[PDB]
Design a protein around this ligand. Structure first.
Ligand SMILES: [Mg+2]
Ligand SMILES: [Zn+2]
Lengths: 43, 145, 172, 244, 98, 212, 98, 288, 49
RNA sequence: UAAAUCGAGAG
DNA sequence: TCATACGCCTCTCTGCTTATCGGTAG
DNA sequence: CTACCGATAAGCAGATCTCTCGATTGCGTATGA
């Protein structure tokens, strides 16, 4: 449902994609505080 | 004085007539949201004990304390149902509890691996339990050469 | 059971010698524990005991339709008059001797005759025992059913209780 | 043994086995009815037979009935005699109960059978009669005292207990002190043993015996008292009638 | 081929092993431990394990094991498991009954 | 009306001072037990207006607080005069926090605050900015009977406790980041807390939660 | 999830229906199973057992068995039980070899 | 419904009708009370089947997630908590209790002095720091249970038990001395500790659910002149535990009042704080 | 990993499971939120059931 | 010997 | 005339989830 | 002006211990005899 037919990517942005990917990868190791601190890399 | 509804901020203004240091309520979610986890645990114990005062079966507070600390083990007013159950490492016990289809789908979708800790999982696999007599191991001392 | 909703299972077949005997040589055929009455409050059985005793003594039948007696015609007194005329104790008691010691009991025993009816629910229909036998096909577990020589079920409550004891090898 | 529903822990204990070659039904003592919440309303309860020594030892020590004396719900006792033994105790421990040598010795040996190991010492020891002349006369409280003194292990002082019972003083006459139960070095000196002494009543004689001499001595005391109040109830039966 | 598999498990096993000098668990032998040790010892005797305690015509392995524990000669070693996986190794001889 | 509003503002100020002291900054019994006559003599106009501009203050760590937490920084507060929250009224505060180099920032508003600040408050690391409400601090929550004594637990003590019980930060009982207790303590996530529960069957016994 | 039924006779349960409700495989065959070596009958009271035994009728005592292993001290009692056989209590029903 | 008869002398037919009606009510309530506990029991035991006391005297789920560090703050078995407050009974049976405990064999595997000194220091600290607001109690020495293992260090007891023991030894002056009695009582507290392995979760679940089987529409139905009538029984228990309802049927709070506020100047506050609807002041309406 | 805070196998506990569920559910909900694809601009029609 | 539904039910 | 194999033939509680309509940024 | 965010209202989904006996098991139909 949340996909684009043409570009064949998620209908959300491609930078939130990597944000959530990195968040899940880091939190998988039980680094909870680091997962929330990652969002501070915004600029 | 006892009211008929919960709203802590209403009487906080009226300091003259009410000693706001002892406002205890029949609610639990409001207590958790406006007074933190520990006040919620205290009110949980109080409201599960006063239900045993009327209909007097006195019960030791150790069981009530364990119940409250399990109800608030994640900092929120959890519950002993399927809505407050998914937050567990072993899904064998959840799917044994109820909604086997619901919990199995999540368990396999994220490749959740059960480490065989809960008694129900050990029973399903068929391994010696981990509580009580099975909480340790026994070694035989042999005098070889 | 009697005609007042007093169940009871025959606990033991008491031999007649060990059975307590009375002054006249009457050994009762049924013992009902007196502690039942204070909670059940089946005073109808107590009245029926002495009414039946009087009826059997005098060779008559006493009607027991509700609302014949009243406050000033108490059935206890009314049947006690007949019992006293017959020559027994006015209160329905009766001297009794233990069948083992042979000595008279401390107080006279309340003895009478009451209408007793057997019940259909037997005991052999509740019997069950299984060591080994038939098993299920898809689970390799004992079958269900008394006639099928199947086992009893140790359900969720029994499993949880077996855990609560701290017993684990019992659970296994 | 288990009496469904197994609501709490005590509804599944481990009993020892006694093979009575007479009947076709399971035979169970009266102390377990309160714990099982069972009846004798034609109740049917299961009987599992563990098959490995692990399970045997685990049921004999952890799940055995003696160790389950106090329910973990509130610490109150859950065992004890119930219905006729209580009235038998009330009658036997009163002041009117005097026994000659015959009755005293018979009542004692009817419940302190040493061949089965009920008592420790190889010889049943008795007590001097409370009356010497015109002829020896014991008392029911003396029966209780010597029963305790024979089941209580030797090389250990008797119970020093002071308690009460449900029967008020004014129901025993004037100036009576039977409402208060008193012990002194394993000897009963005052009061009667109603429900508040054996049964599901806290701070009783059997409860104190448990806490002092372990659970096995409490179980033996309960069994011995049940046997004594049964043999005594056949000699002088308790009955109710219309006159009451 | 197999050493890398074996060495990693022994290091982990030696890691969780609490040193004898710093075991801070209950010195007494708990009821569960008594039951388990008695059962396992009785099983060993039933399987013809040697016994150094004299038997006075006794036939019950559980009673034999209880006698052994009372006289304190059980050749068994407990292994108390801490929740993380650390284990301490007490012995029955140094354990206190009740 | 005006006297009631002034009393409420006063009580909020007292709660703020007490919360700073509990967090561990140098605060005396004065400016906490400030009487009404003194408050109306000091923080009042010719008619008695709140004039909340001069109610702002700084908080510096005590020597004991520095010894316990070597990295504990400074704190700043500001009470908004306007009934709402102004976008630029928060920009000035947020730039001033970094301008004066304050490690922690506490903000208080009157009724409501524009959602943009929610998106903007966690923007300047390592500085932390928190927001509170005047009507939500009329009475302190740590003074309540059910609420136990929450005391923050140091990193060395956290390591000692974890080594003693052989635990992980995740395996401790968890306390949320939105409770009025954790916000009162200013407890950064990952720090273990210590709770002194007045247990009915054990008197005083201590339990440790972790904010995560 | 099946669609289409006007009168029918019974909606056939699926695989998910075999593991979902109380009658499902989980709560009926894994959290509790029927057991071997177990009996069930009526209980009758008996103030002649020491409040820790049970009165097993001989009809039970001829069915339930325990697999006692033979050994150097159990030989006499087990030999007597075997000689008695499955009908005379105490007795043996099966002699399981090694 | 008021009947003057007695079961010994019979009852008139109207009284018999009323008695039958009451018996019918009881018979229905028996079925309801038999039906109303299973789901609560099952859910509680399913949730708590794993949590058990570990070898550190800390109860935690089979996963490892802690629930409490101390079992109730004390870690004494409930089945053995019976006679740790009966000071008179313990003093009277001192000799038998000591012979049972055998303190002679409980020294080479025990430490007494460190725990005793720490407990004494803590006790005198709280004695100095008894009367003051709770939020001001800056703890310098945590309770002795925190560091010293109560099953390894003699004298490590709860603050309630220690306070009660000291109060008893102060009030009651008894040939045995107070020191030997205190040593035996501390040994009793050590011996009455919940063993590591207890299925404490199942114990708690059963102790909360099994008594729930004995509650139904009891005599607690009050209609004297007026009351709040909050929920109770297993409906309230299900609301509290099973559902965690944030919209409970009868939410209310307790408001303590200052001791200088009498019945007057408080009744008017109650009336002012109470809700009044528009309908409660309109006598009627005349729509033309 | 270096200081022993988490073995290479990862630490799966109740709180990390909670955070996994919260983050994943919120991330899916945000996926289902909008309708225009801000990756190529060429948005696509949704599907019904 | 199955499996499902209904009635009588027992604790 | 007419039998067995195919073809279907109206009086309870808790959540969660999504649709639609108010307000605010740009 | 118009896109984004919540705030109800309706629908969706799921809940409200063991065992023994007895009884029972569909109409419609359509072509080969
Ligand atoms: Mg029953
Ligand atoms: Zn696209």
């Amino acid at each position: 449902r949340a996909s684009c037919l043409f570009c064949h990517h998620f209908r959300l942005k491609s930078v939130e994609v990597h944000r959530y990917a990195c968040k899940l990868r880091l939190l998988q190791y039980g680094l909870i505080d680091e997962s929330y601190k990652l969002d501070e890399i915004t600029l | 004085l006892v009211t008929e509804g919960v709203n802590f901020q209403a009487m906080w203004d009226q300091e003259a007539f009410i000693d706001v240091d002892g406002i205890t309520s029949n609610d639990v979610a409001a207590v958790l949201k406006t007074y933190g986890v520990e006040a919620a645990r205290n009110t949980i114990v109080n409201e599960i004990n006063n239900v045993f005062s009327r209909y007097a079966i006195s019960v030791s507070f150790r069981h009530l304390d364990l119940i409250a600390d399990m109800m608030t083990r994640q900092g929120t007013y959890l519950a002993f149902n399927r809505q407050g159950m998914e937050t567990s490492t072993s899904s064998f016990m959840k799917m044994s509890y109820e909604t086997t289809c619901q919990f199995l789908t999540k368990a396999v979708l994220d490749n959740e691996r059960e480490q065989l800790d809960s008694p129900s999982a050990r029973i399903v696999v068929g391994k010696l339990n981990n509580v009580g007599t099975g909480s340790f191991d026994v070694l035989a001392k042999v005098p070889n050469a | 059971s009697s005609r007042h909703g007093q169940k009871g299972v025959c606990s033991r077949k008491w031999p007649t010698i060990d059975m307590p005997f009375s002054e006249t040589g009457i050994q009762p055929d049924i013992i009902i524990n007196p502690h039942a009455f204070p909670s059940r409050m089946t005073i109808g059985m107590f009245v029926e005991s002495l009414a039946g005793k009087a009826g059997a003594l005098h060779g008559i039948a006493q009607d027991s339709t509700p609302w014949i007696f009243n406050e000033d015609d108490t059935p206890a007194d009314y049947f006690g008059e007949q019992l006293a005329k017959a020559g027994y104790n006015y209160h329905g008691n009766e001297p009794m001797y233990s069948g083992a010691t042979g000595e008279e009991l401390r107080a006279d025993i309340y003895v009478g005759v009451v209408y007793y009816q057997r019940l259909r629910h037997m005991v052999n229909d509740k019997f069950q025992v299984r060591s080994t036998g038939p098993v299920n096909s898809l689970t390799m577990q004992p079958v269900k059913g008394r006639k099928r020589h199947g086992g009893i079920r140790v359900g969720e409550m029994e499993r949880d209780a077996l855990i609560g004891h701290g017993t684990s090898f019992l659970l296994q | 043994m288990n009496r469904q529903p197994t609501l709490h822990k005590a509804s599944m204990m481990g009993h020892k086995v006694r093979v009575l070659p007479n009947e076709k039904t399971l035979r169970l003592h009266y102390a377990n009815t309160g714990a099982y919440n069972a009846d004798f309303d034609g109740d049917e309860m299961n009987m599992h037979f563990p098959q490995n020594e692990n399970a045997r030892a685990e049921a004999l020590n952890l799940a055995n009935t003696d160790s389950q004396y106090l329910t973990p719900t509130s610490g109150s006792p859950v065992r004890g005699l119930i219905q006729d033994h209580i009235s038998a105790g009330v009658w036997l421990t009163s002041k009117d109960s005097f026994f000659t040598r015959e009755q005293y010795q018979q009542y004692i040996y009817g419940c302190i059978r040493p061949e089965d190991g009920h008592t420790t010492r190889s010889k049943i020891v008795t007590l001097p009669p409370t009356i010497f002349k015109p002829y020896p006369l014991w008392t029911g409280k003396q029966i209780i005292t010597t029963v305790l003194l024979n089941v209580t292990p030797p090389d250990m002082p008797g119970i020093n207990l002071i308690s009460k019972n449900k029967i008020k003083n004014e129901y025993w006459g004037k100036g009576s002190l039977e409402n208060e139960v008193l012990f002194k070095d394993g000897a009963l000196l005052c009061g009667i043993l109603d429900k508040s002494q054996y049964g599901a009543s806290k701070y009783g004689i059997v409860h104190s015996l448990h806490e002092v001499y372990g659970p096995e001595v409490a179980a033996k005391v309960l069994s011995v008292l049940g046997r004594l109040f049964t043999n005594y109830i056949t000699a002088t039966a308790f009955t109710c009638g219309m006159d009451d | 081929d197999f050493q890398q598999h074996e060495q990693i498990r022994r290091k982990t096993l030696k890691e969780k092993a609490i040193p004898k000098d710093q075991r801070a668990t209950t010195p007494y032998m708990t009821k569960y431990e008594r039951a388990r040790i008695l059962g396992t010892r009785a099983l060993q005797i039933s399987m013809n394990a040697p016994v150094f305690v004299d038997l006075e015509g006794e036939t019950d392995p559980l009673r034999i094991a209880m006698k052994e524990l009372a006289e304190k000669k059980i050749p068994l070693v407990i292994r108390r498991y801490l929740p993380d996986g650390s284990f301490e190794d007490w012995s029955v001889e140094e354990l206190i009954v009740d | 009306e005006n006297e009631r509003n002034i009393s409420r503002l006063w009580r909020a100020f007292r709660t703020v001072k007490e919360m700073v002291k509990d967090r561990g900054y140098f605060i005396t019994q004065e400016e906490v037990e400030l009487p009404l006559e003194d408050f109306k003599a000091k923080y009042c106009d010719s008619m008695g207006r709140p004039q909340r501009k001069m109610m702002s203050f700084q908080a510096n760590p005590t020597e004991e607080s520095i010894s316990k937490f070597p990295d504990m920084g400074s704190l700043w507060v500001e009470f908004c005069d306007e009934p709402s929250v102004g976008v630029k009224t928060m920009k000035t505060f947020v730039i001033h926090i970094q301008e004066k180099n304050f490690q922690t920032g506490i903000f208080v508003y009157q009724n409501n605050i524009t959602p943009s600040a929610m998106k903007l408050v966690p923007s300047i690391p390592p500085a932390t900015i928190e927001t509170f409400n005047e009507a939500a601090l009329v009475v302190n929550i740590t003074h309540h009977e059910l609420v136990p004594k929450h005391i923050r637990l140091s990193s060395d003590e956290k390591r000692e406790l974890l080594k003693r019980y052989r635990l992980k930060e995740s395996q401790l009982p968890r306390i949320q980041r939105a409770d009025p207790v954790a916000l009162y303590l200013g407890l950064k996530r990952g720090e273990v807390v210590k709770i002194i529960r007045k247990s009915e069957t054990s008197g005083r016994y201590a339990s440790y939660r972790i904010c995560m | 999830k099946a669609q289409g039924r006007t009168s029918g006779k019974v909606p056939i349960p699926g695989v998910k229906q075999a593991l979902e409700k109380k009658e499902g495989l989980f709560r009926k065959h894994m959290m509790g199973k029927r057991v071997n070596y177990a009996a069930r009958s009526v209980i009758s009271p008996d103030p002649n057992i020491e409040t820790n035994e049970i009165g097993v009728p001989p009809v039970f005592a001829v069915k339930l068995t325990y697999p006692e292993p033979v050994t150097a001290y159990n030989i006499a009692e087990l030999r007597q039980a075997v000689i008695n056989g499955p009908d005379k209590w105490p007795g043996a029903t099966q002699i399981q070899n090694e | 419904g008021y009947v003057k008869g007695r079961f010994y002398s019979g009852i008139k037919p109207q009284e018999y009708y009323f008695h039958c009606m009451a018996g019918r009510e009881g018979l229905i309530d028996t079925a309801v009370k038999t039906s109303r506990s299973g789901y609560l029991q099952r859910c509680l035991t399913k949730q708590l089947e794993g949590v058990h006391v570990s070898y550190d005297n800390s109860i935690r789920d089979a996963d490892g997630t802690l629930v409490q560090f101390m079992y109730g703050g004390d870690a004494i078995d409930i089945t053995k908590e019976s006679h740790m407050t009966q000071f008179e009974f313990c003093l009277d049976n001192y000799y038998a209790l000591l012979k049972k405990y055998n303190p002679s064999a409980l020294i080479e595997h025990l430490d007494v002095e460190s725990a005793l000194k720490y407990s004494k220091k803590t006790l005198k600290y709280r004695k100095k720091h008894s009367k003051e607001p709770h939020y001001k109690q800056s703890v310098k020495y945590d309770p002795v249970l925190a560091k010293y293992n109560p099953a390894k260090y003699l004298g490590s007891v709860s603050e309630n038990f220690q306070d009660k023991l000291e109060s008893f030894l102060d009030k009651n002056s008894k040939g045995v001395n107070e020191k030997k009695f205190r040593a035996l009582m501390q040994l009793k507290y050590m011996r009455s500790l919940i063993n590591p392995g207890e299925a404490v979760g199942i114990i708690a679940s059963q102790s909360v659910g099994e008594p729930s089987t004995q509650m139904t529409l009891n005599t607690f139905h009050f209609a004297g002149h007026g009351a709040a009538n909050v929920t109770l029984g297993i409906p309230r228990l299900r609301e509290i535990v099973m559902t965690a309802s944030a919209a409970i049927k009868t939410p209310q709070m307790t408001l303590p009042i200052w001791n200088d506020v009498s019945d007057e100047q408080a009744d008017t506050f109650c009336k002012s704080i109470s809700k009044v609807l528009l309908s409660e002041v309109i006598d009627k309406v005349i729509v033309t | 990993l270096s200081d022993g805070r988490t073995t290479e196998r990862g630490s799966f506990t109740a709180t990390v499971n909670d955070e996994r569920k919260k983050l994943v559910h919120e991330f899916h909900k945000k996926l289902l939120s909008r309708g225009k694809c801000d990756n190529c601009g060429m948005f696509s029609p949704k599907f019904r059931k």
